[PDB]
Amino acid sequence: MASDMEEKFREAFILFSSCSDHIEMYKFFELMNSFGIILTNDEKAALPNDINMDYWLNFAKKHYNYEQ
Prior knowledge:
Helices cover about 60% and strands about 0% of the residues.
């Protein structure tokens, strides 16, 4: 389900951010790739410097491939 996935997204943010309010950019790349999300270079360059859980949840709901 989508709710199932949102809980997976949340727990993964906690893991990849080491329990922090903001995730380092290179760890954000690891986090998104762990869910199959591949950004283009200039999409990466457009990410804001400060990435919190709500940013990641909105991002993951937009980019995740629910077919796979």
